[PDB]
Write an enzyme that holds these catalytic residues in place. Structure first.
Site, mmCIF file in Angstrom:
data_model
loop_
_atom_site.group_PDB
_atom_site.id
_atom_site.type_symbol
_atom_site.label_atom_id
_atom_site.label_comp_id
_atom_site.label_asym_id
_atom_site.label_seq_id
_atom_site.Cartn_x
_atom_site.Cartn_y
_atom_site.Cartn_z
ATOM 1 N N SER A 1 0.803 -1.223 0.000
ATOM 2 C CA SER A 1 0.000 0.000 0.000
ATOM 3 C C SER A 1 0.827 1.258 0.000
ATOM 4 O O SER A 1 0.206 2.319 -0.110
ATOM 5 C CB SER A 1 -0.947 -0.003 1.173
ATOM 6 O OG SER A 1 -2.116 -0.744 0.857
ATOM 7 N N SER B 1 -5.994 3.221 4.279
ATOM 8 C CA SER B 1 -5.512 2.150 3.419
ATOM 9 C C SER B 1 -6.649 1.347 2.775
ATOM 10 O O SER B 1 -6.562 0.147 2.554
ATOM 11 C CB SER B 1 -4.512 1.224 4.099
ATOM 12 O OG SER B 1 -3.511 0.879 3.156
#
Ligand SMILES: OC[C@H]1O[C@@](CO)(O[C@H]2O[C@H](CO)[C@@H](O)[C@H](O)[C@H]2O)[C@@H](O)[C@@H]1O
Length: 263
Positions: A45, A105
Site C-alpha cells: 500500500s 488504506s
C-alpha cells in the site's frame, strides 16, 4: 564498508530473519543514509501515495477534479474497504477516495484512483514524469500485494521512493495547493502508530503511509519534521522468506529509532 548506522540496521535485519531496506534523506545537507537502498522491494500500500499524487497532478489543470463524485457499486468492493463500504450505491469524490486510500488504506479507494489514471500504467507514467525511474505498478488491489521474493512486479527501491517522497512533499513535483494537500493527508494517517512513528521522538511531526502484504511484507514511508532542524524523508521496507510470515511493524519502529540517533 559500513557506518555504525548501517551496522545497527544489518543487525536488526539479521535478528528479524528478513530483508530490510532503508533510505534516509536529511534535507539540512541532502545527505542520504542507505541500507539495501538500491534493492527492489514490494511496495504494497505504499504505492497509494503515487496514485494519490498522480490524481493531484491531474487536478492542477482540472480545478474541481478532486470534488468530482465517483459512484461506488457493490461489485467494486475488494478485500478491505473500511470507508468505501459506507458509500455503496452512493458516491465518493476523488478527494474522499484519496483520503480513504491514504489515511485508512482502503483498497477499493485505491482501485478507483487507479481507474481514474487509466490503469496501473497510468500510475507508473506519473512516476516517470516526476523523475522516478524505478517505481513500477503492474497490478490492482489486491493482487499487487503478493510480494513474491525476487518478483519485480509492483516494486521500487528505498532510494527511489525516498527521492520521490521528498519531491512530492517538500519539493515541487506537485503544485503548491496540491503539495499542501498531500502533506495534510499523510499527516492524518491512522494506520502508522506502530511503524516509523513508534520509533521517533514524540515531538516530531510525521506524515506517512504504511504497507503490508504477503511474505510478511511490512513497509512505511514518511516525511518527518524534527523539532528545531530541517525535515527528513525516511523509507523503511521489510519482507520475509515465507509466504505466511507475520507482520513486523516493530522492525520499522526499530529502524526509525536507529536512524534518529544523532538527529
Ligand atoms: O473499483 C472498481 C475499479 O477498479 C478497477 C481497477 O482500477 O478494477 C478492480 O476492481 C474490479 C471490481 O471489483 C475488479 O474486477 C478488477 O479485477 C480490479 O482490478 C477498475 O477496472 C474498476 O473500474
Amino acid at each position: 564498508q559500513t557506518s555504525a548506522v548501517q551496522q545497527k540496521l544489518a543487525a536488526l535485519e539479521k535478528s528479524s530473519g528478513g530483508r530490510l531496506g532503508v533510505a534516509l534523506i536529511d534535507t539540512a545537507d541532502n545527505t542520504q543514509v542507505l541500507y539495501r537502498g538500491d534493492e527492489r522491494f514490494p511496495m504494497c500500500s505504499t504505492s497509494k501515495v503515487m496514485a494519490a499524487a498522480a490524481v493531484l497532478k491531474q487536478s492542477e489543470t482540472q480545478k474541481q477534479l478532486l470534488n468530482q463524485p465517483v459512484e461506488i457499486k457493490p461489485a467494486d468492493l475488494v478485500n478491505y474497504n473500511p470507508i468505501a463500504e459506507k458509500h455503496v450505491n452512493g458516491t465518493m469524490t476523488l478527494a474522499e477516495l484519496s483520503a480513504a486510500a491514504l489515511q485508512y488504506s482502503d483498497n477499493t479507494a485505491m482501485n478507483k484512483l487507479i481507474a481514474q489514471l487509466g490503469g496501473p500504467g497510468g500510475v507508473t507514467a506519473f512516476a516517470r514524469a516526476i523523475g522516478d525511474e524505478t517505481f513500477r505498478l503492474d497490478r490492482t488491489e489486491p493482487t499487487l500485494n503478493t510480494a513474491i521474493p525476487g518478483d519485480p512486479r509492483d516494486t521500487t527501491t528505498p532510494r527511489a521512493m525516498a527521492q520521490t517522497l521528498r519531491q512530492l512533499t517538500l519539493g515541487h513535483a506537485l503544485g503548491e495547493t496540491q503539495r499542501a494537500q498531500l502533506v495534510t493527508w499523510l499527516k492524518g494517517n491512522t494506520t502508522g502508530a506502530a511503524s516509523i512513528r513508534a520509533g521517533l521522538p514524540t515531538s516530531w511531526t510525521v506524515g506517512d503511509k504504511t504497507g503490508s502484504g504477503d511474505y510478511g511484507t511490512t513497509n512505511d514511508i514518511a516525511v518527518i519534521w524534527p523539532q528545531g532542524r530541517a525535515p527528513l524523508v525516511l523509507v523503511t521496507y521489510f519482507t520475509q522468506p515465507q509466504q505466511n510470515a507475520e507482520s513486523r511493524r516493530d522492525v520499522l519502529a526499530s529502524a526509525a529509532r536507529i536512524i534518529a540517533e544523532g538527529l
